């Protein structure tokens, strides 16, 4: 559980942790709840209650995350100092990053209470799935949910070129690492730290990017098989649980990859600032 949290610093003076399994899990039951109310035409009105329930689930989950905020900002203020013109500052960062993660681990059951509250609500609606003939079930729920909740995201992802967005950052890290070698100085220390944090950010962007590319295709393939059909009630439920899984896996990796994209370029903005100082105002 300790190696499944991602840190995001989108703006210079920002920090946010994302518990990858928690976010995937809560998203899995968001799709399950929606599919459940949208299969039966009569249960469409439930959408208001489900919307306002998921609202308070995100609200209550974020109220737990905020308990670590005092530690979070203590770490932000250390990063803020570390990027500007070192042994004690590096250990100041380590002890605070490890302290913030421990804070999160202390609320393990406090987040899983919100998770279990969601799992129970989504399963409660899912068990209320009603078919006219349990042999010939309709795939209308899968279509309204895909059209109004998933297709938009797929087209948004297909619009951007994530393989290009990776090839951009390989060139950036190629030129920063190349300049670092030529630099033969306390500036070199802070530049080697930003370059190291970005190098191990590109890995997270590349990782999430593979998930997005493969889930995009695997969702577009499975959605052609689950719509305009008359499924057996058992196979219908199994295919809803199948879809909600691919949807949860895709959304989580897209949400994180876009946070990681802004995170890489916000810190790359400050890497080129130190270059403009170490050379222009120094030589």
């Amino acid at each position, epitope marked *: 559980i300790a190696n499944s949290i991602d840190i995001l610093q989108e703006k210079e003076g920002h920090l946010d942790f994302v518990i990858i399994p928690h976010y995937t899990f809560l998203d899995y039951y968001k799709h399950l709840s929606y599919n459940s109310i949208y299969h039966k035409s009569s249960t469409y009105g439930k959408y208001i209650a489900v919307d306002a329930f998921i609202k308070k689930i995100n609200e209550a989950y974020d109220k737990v995350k905020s308990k670590c905020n005092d530690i979070k900002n203590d770490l932000i203020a250390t990063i803020k100092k570390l990027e500007h013109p070192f042994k004690k500052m590096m250990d100041e960062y380590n002890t605070k990053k490890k302290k913030l993660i421990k804070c999160i681990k202390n609320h393990e059951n406090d987040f899983n209470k919100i998770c279990m509250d969601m799992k129970n609500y989504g399963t409660n609606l899912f068990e209320q799935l009603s078919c006219y003939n349990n042999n010939f079930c309709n795939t209308n*729920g899968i279509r309204y949910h895909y059209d109004e909740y998933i297709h938009k995201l797929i087209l948004s992802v297909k619009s951007k070129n994530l393989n290009k967005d990776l090839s951009d950052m390989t060139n950036i890290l190629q030129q920063s690492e190349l300049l670092l070698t030529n630099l033969n100085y306390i500036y070199i220390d802070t530049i080697k730290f930003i370059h190291k944090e970005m190098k191990h950010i590109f890995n997270r962007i590349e990782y999430h990017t593979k998930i997005i590319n493969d889930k995009t295709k695997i969702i577009q393939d499975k959605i052609k098989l689950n719509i305009w059909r008359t499924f057996q009630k058992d196979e219908l439920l199994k295919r809803i649980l199948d879809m909600s899984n691919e949807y949860s896996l895709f959304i989580t990796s897209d949400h994180l990859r876009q946070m990681l994209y802004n995170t890489f370029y916000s810190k790359e903005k400050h890497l080129n600032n130190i270059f403009h100082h170490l050379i222009y105002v120094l030589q």
Partner: antibody, heavy 117, light 109 residues
Framework: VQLVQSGAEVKKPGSSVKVSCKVSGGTFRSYAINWVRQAPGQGLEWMGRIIPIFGTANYAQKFQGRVTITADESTSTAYMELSSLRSEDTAVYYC???????????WGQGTMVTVSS | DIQMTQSPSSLSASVGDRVTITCQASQDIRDSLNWYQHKPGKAPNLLISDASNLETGVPSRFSGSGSGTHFTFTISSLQPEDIATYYCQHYDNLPSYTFGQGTKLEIKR
């Protein structure tokens, strides 16, 4: 969402027609755009269906061979091509989206395609 | 493929009356019956979806009923705005959009 078809047209007998249908969504998603015609007196007559996400069109036995349904995802428009027209084809041509109710939810305004020289 | 015998063809019933249109089927259709109100000039409006579900914004007078081979459409109280031709239809995923013959409801006043 709303379906917008072309305006009326007189087509020479023996010619082909192409009735448009723009979707107000940007893409057709998993929609099924259907074409149904109403002859002079005769009731509604289903002609064909196109599911752009699938990439396959399905026609009624009567219209297999003359009708061809195409869909441009660039403009999110679906076209119906009634080739080698005859007087009998003078009718109102309609659009329809097979909605989540398993029925024709959104309908186009109609296109008065008349077959005369 | 599945014949839809919809009756009557015409209907001259007065205002504040009950009107009952019927749709039949050559084979078994579970719950796939859609009822429409085709007004002159205007494109057909979907009233009942999947044999009984009232479409959002269709008055409560209208009501789809029945299942199997015989389905019914009932207008609780005839209103002067209910003069139009009413059709039934079926969908089978094959696909199969077979249509009804058409009941022309004209008010005898």
């Amino acid at each position: 969402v709303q379906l917008v078809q072309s305006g009326a047209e007189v087509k020479k007998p023996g010619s082909s027609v192409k009735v448009s249908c723009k979707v107000s969504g940007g893409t057709f998603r998993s929609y099924a755009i259907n074409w149904v015609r109403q002859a002079p007196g005769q009731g509604l007559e289903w002609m064909g269906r196109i599911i752009p996400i699938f990439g396959t069109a399905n026609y009624a036995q009567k219209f297999q061979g003359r009708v061809t349904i195409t869909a441009d995802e660039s403009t999110s428009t679906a076209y119906m091509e009634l080739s080698s027209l005859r007087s009998e084809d003078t009718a109102v041509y309609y659009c329809a989206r097979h909605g989540y109710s398993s029925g024709l939810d959104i309908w186009g305004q109609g296109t008065m395609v008349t077959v005369s020289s | 493929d599945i014949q839809m015998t919809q009756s009557p063809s015409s209907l001259s019933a007065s205002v504040g009356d009950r009107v009952t249109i019927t749709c039949q089927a050559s084979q078994d259709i579970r719950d796939s019956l859609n009822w429409y109100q085709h007004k002159p000039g205007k494109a057909p409006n979907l009233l009942i979806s999947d044999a009984s579900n009232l479409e959002t914004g269709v008055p409560s007078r209208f009501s789809g009923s029945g299942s199997g081979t015989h389905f019914t459409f009932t207008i609780s109280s005839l209103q002067p705005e209910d003069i139009a031709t009413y059709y039934c239809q079926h969908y089978d995923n094959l696909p199969s959009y077979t249509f009804g013959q058409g009941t022309k409801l004209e008010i005898k006043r």
